[PDB]
Design an enzyme around this catalytic site. Structure first.
Site, mmCIF file in Angstrom:
data_model
loop_
_atom_site.group_PDB
_atom_site.id
_atom_site.type_symbol
_atom_site.label_atom_id
_atom_site.label_comp_id
_atom_site.label_asym_id
_atom_site.label_seq_id
_atom_site.Cartn_x
_atom_site.Cartn_y
_atom_site.Cartn_z
ATOM 1 N N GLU A 1 0.791 -1.128 0.086
ATOM 2 C CA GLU A 1 -0.046 0.023 -0.051
ATOM 3 C C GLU A 1 0.913 1.286 -0.176
ATOM 4 O O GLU A 1 0.567 2.313 -0.883
ATOM 5 C CB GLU A 1 -1.112 0.014 1.048
ATOM 6 C CG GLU A 1 -1.807 1.306 1.294
ATOM 7 C CD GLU A 1 -2.909 1.248 2.290
ATOM 8 O OE1 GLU A 1 -3.008 0.461 3.087
ATOM 9 O OE2 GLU A 1 -4.001 2.184 2.101
ATOM 10 N N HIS A 16 2.023 1.781 -3.932
ATOM 11 C CA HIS A 16 0.593 2.067 -4.335
ATOM 12 C C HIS A 16 0.423 3.635 -4.012
ATOM 13 O O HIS A 16 0.168 4.467 -4.919
ATOM 14 C CB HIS A 16 -0.375 1.269 -3.785
ATOM 15 C CG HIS A 16 -1.475 1.964 -3.400
ATOM 16 N ND1 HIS A 16 -2.042 2.630 -2.720
ATOM 17 C CD2 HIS A 16 -2.881 1.984 -4.493
ATOM 18 C CE1 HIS A 16 -3.207 3.096 -2.812
ATOM 19 N NE2 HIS A 16 -3.847 2.735 -3.932
ATOM 20 N N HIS A 20 0.122 6.904 -6.732
ATOM 21 C CA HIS A 20 -0.845 7.725 -6.750
ATOM 22 C C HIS A 20 -0.542 9.082 -7.083
ATOM 23 O O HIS A 20 -0.928 9.884 -7.957
ATOM 24 C CB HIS A 20 -1.867 7.821 -5.419
ATOM 25 C CG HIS A 20 -2.963 6.929 -5.674
ATOM 26 N ND1 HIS A 20 -4.055 7.232 -5.595
ATOM 27 C CD2 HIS A 20 -3.039 5.663 -5.541
ATOM 28 C CE1 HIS A 20 -5.161 6.233 -5.400
ATOM 29 N NE2 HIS A 20 -4.551 5.279 -5.410
ATOM 30 N N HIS A 56 -4.741 0.358 -10.834
ATOM 31 C CA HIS A 56 -5.405 -0.690 -9.713
ATOM 32 C C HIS A 56 -5.473 -1.903 -10.162
ATOM 33 O O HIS A 56 -5.134 -2.999 -9.604
ATOM 34 C CB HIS A 56 -6.552 -0.206 -9.306
ATOM 35 C CG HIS A 56 -6.007 0.933 -8.184
ATOM 36 N ND1 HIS A 56 -5.780 2.417 -8.466
ATOM 37 C CD2 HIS A 56 -5.903 0.875 -6.723
ATOM 38 C CE1 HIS A 56 -5.641 2.978 -7.415
ATOM 39 N NE2 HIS A 56 -5.695 2.227 -6.331
HETATM 40 CU CU LIG Z 1 -5.479 3.269 -4.687
HETATM 41 O O LIG Z 2 -7.026 3.896 -4.500
HETATM 42 O O LIG Z 3 -6.214 3.582 -2.613
#
Ligand SMILES: [Cu+2]
Ligand SMILES: [O]
Ligand SMILES: [O]
Ligand SMILES: *[C@@H]1O[C@H](CO)[C@@H](O)[C@H](O)[C@H]1NC(C)=O
Ligand SMILES: [Cu+2]
Ligand SMILES: [Mg+2]
Ligand SMILES: [Mg+2]
Ligand SMILES: [Mg+2]
Ligand SMILES: [Mg+2]
Lengths: 325, 325
Positions: A1, A16, A20, A56
């Site tokens: 994450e 992740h 973003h 994703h």
């Molecule tokens: Cu995400």
């Molecule tokens: O996300």
């Molecule tokens: O996320």
């Protein structure tokens, strides 16, 4: 994450969350133009951007290499002994449509000193669907009533090229529609489950105006305020339970797995209230109530469909969803 | 004979007119008559280094005189270090001087100059000696080709002269604004001497440990980089970018300098991608090496040949990184 639970963020970083920001800033990657962060840099806005879903899926495939690494489930892994799904049916047509929804924009505008507010609203078109009921006929040939977990997924039959998918090719595309725990009495009985009760979804939120009205009325009158009927805001919107489908109709596989609820909920009580959104949002203030891997029993490779077809407590049937434009 | 005066004079004579046979009759006599293998008690290693070098010489395996030399060339470095190893084992000055005179006339001049410099620096026999500036011992390596050509013309015409050097490139080349930094003859002596004082080929079996060498390697080059960027800032330029193995090297270079033997130094065009270098490495090998070093940094440990961890989350870690980088 990555999260603060990561055992080694110095080495593994934060793929992740950093992605973003990487994606969000591609309109001004070096900061030359003084642009603010992209929509990908807020959870309020991220799914507006098409690239959200490409990012994703990329991440999902990382997880998938891990879940694909385990041995496929066997008959003995999957069988809930003495529990057969005899039939799966739906009461009511599966129909989607668009309707209208309003919310207030007052907080977005600037209020003058001692000039009165005026009502300013946005009206959006949103997907919705008609209510329906699952009818799952199960035969319990164990000598006693048994707690069962009902796991309900919607799976594609064909892709956009009209090619029929194998179960192994469909399983990672299935979407979760429901998960619930219910005692199955001995004998043959049809379990009824309303679409409105899905543990995947929650209703539209009450408006700010409504919350102000209710709180003000209670405080000003000295009455107790009971908002307990309101659900959490975590969960797929009830209105988006089903995919849009097509005006001409589309057929899908409705997949039902009935599993041993005593094993699945061990330590979490099968009588206790697990709330309205436990499938993906868990239970507020409590442990997650289903011990099985998320996605069970579709989260491992299924190279041999015969294995699933030989398990009496698993059944899929064809359903049709029609969009009304 | 071991007095500073005589040792300095000996070194001055050995380094004089380095591309020609020695013009000093006393050094001529030594080079003709001295036997490096003639008295093993001269050496702290019972004569082993002298045997090693004499075997390479007698087998005609050494680089010829009047040929370019690069310290980065493995075999040429090995040959220079064979002579260093002899000088480093001499107990008394006459052994050091006589071996230097002997091998001056047998070995490539670039190897000889290198070995004599590091021999003086790393032997207690060298204490008190001041090494002549390399820009007067091998001026080709510090002087652009145009000025060398004027020197050749002065010699061809038997006329003394002093010639002005005036930096490479044109004013159209913004990089020329800071040529006074990296082309300064003293900055170049600083750089060569640091590496002579702290050589990457050092082994403590040569006699002593070089304290914190790997960390000093980081620091001296960090300061060269930071000082260059201060010159760029002084001259209305941005900081240097970092090299990337997969990205273009924006700024090319025309040295406009020549070897005494070997021809003109090669030019690099602007804006070129790295290519594999036959006999050296693939560009991808550089990327893998970089990745492995960053793996150690982000792990917090270097991996030993048998796989065990070498902790670098401690003050010596930066030094160990210098050792491996
Ligand atoms: Cu995400
Ligand atoms: O996300
Ligand atoms: O996320
Ligand atoms: C070389 O430099 C000196 C001093 O800067 C000057 O007097 C002389 O004229 C110069 N020679 C040439 C050819 O420019
Ligand atoms: Cu250096
Ligand atoms: Mg719900
Ligand atoms: Mg089976
Ligand atoms: Mg000679
Ligand atoms: Mg390499």
């Amino acid at each position: 994450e990555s999260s603060m639970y990561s055992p080694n963020a110095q080495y593994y970083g934060s793929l992740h969350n950093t992605a973003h920001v990487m994606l969000g800033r591609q309109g001004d990657p070096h900061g030359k133009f003084n642009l603010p962060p992209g929509v990908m840099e807020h959870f309020e806005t991220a799914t507006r951007d098409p690239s959200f879903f490409r990012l994703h899926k990329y991440m999902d495939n990382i997880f998938k290499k891990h879940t694909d690494s385990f041995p496929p489930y066997t008959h003995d892994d999957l069988e809930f002994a003495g529990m057969a799904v005899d039939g799966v049916a739906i009461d009511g047509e599966l129909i989607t449509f668009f309707d209208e929804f309003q919310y207030s924009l007052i907080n977005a505008v600037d209020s003058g000193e001692s000039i009165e507010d005026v009502e300013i609203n946005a009206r959006v078109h949103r997907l919705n669907h008609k209510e329906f009921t699952y009818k799952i006929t199960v035969s319990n040939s164990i000598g006693s009533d048994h707690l069962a977990t009902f796991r309900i997924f919607l799976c594609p039959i064909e892709d956009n090229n009209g090619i029929t998918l194998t179960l192994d090719k469909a399983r990672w595309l299935c979407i979760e529609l429901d998960k619930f725990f219910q005692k199955v009495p001995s004998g043959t009985h049809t379990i009824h489950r309303s679409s409105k009760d899905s543990s995947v979804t929650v209703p539209d939120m009450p408006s700010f105006h409504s919350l102000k009205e209710q709180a003000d009325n209670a405080v000003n009158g000295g009455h107790d305020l009971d908002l307990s009927a309101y659900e959490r805001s975590c969960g797929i919107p009830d209105r988006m339970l089903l995919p849009k489908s097509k005006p001409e109709g589309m057929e899908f596989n409705l997949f039902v797995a009935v599993t041993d609820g005593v094993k699945d909920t061990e330590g979490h009580n099968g009588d206790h209230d697990h709330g309205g959104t436990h499938a993906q949002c868990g239970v507020h203030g409590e442990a997650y109530p289903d011990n099985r891997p998320l996605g069970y029993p579709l989260e491992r490779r299924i190279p041999d469909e015969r294995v699933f077809d030989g398990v009496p407590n698993i059944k899929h049937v064809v359903v049709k969803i029609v969009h009304h434009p | 004979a071991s007095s500073t005066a005589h040792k300095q004079q000996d070194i001055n004579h050995l380094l004089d007119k380095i591309y020609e046979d020695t013009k000093y009759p006393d050094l001529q006599e030594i080079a003709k008559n001295f036997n490096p293998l003639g008295d093993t008690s001269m050496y702290n290693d019972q004569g082993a280094a002298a045997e090693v070098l004499m075997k390479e010489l007698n087998d005609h395996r050494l680089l010829e005189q009047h040929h370019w030399y690069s310290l980065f060339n493995a075999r040429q470095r090995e040959e220079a270090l064979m002579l260093f190893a002899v000088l480093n084992q001499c107990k008394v000055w006459y052994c050091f001087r006589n071996n230097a005179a002997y091998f001056r006339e047998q070995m490539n001049e670039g190897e000889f100059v290198y070995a004599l410099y590091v021999g003086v620096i790393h032997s207690k026999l060298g204490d008190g000696i001041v090494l002549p500036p390399l820009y007067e011992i091998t001026p080709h390596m510090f002087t652009n080709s145009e000025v060398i050509d004027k020197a050749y013309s002065a010699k061809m015409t038997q006329k003394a002269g002093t010639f002005n050097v005036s930096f490479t490139g044109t004013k159209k080349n913004k990089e020329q604004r800071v040529a006074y930094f990296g082309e300064d003859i003293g900055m170049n002596i600083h750089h060569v001497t640091w590496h002579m004082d702290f050589p990457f080929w050092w082994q403590d079996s040569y006699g002593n440990h070089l304290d914190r060498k790997g960390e000093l390697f980081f620091w001296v080059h960090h300061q060269l980089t930071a000082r260059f960027d201060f010159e760029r800032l002084s001259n209305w330029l941005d900081p240097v970018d970092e090299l990337h193995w997969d990205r273009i090297i924006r700024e090319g270079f025309a040295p406009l300098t020549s070897y005494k033997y070997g021809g003109e130094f090669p030019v690099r065009p602007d804006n070129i991608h790295f290519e594999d270098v036959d006999g050296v490495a693939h560009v991808h090998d550089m990327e893998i090496t970089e990745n492995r070093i960053y793996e150690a940094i982000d792990h917090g440990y270097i991996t030993a040949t048998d796989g065990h961890t070498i902790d670098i989350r401690q003050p010596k870690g930066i030094e160990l990184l210098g050792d491996i980088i």
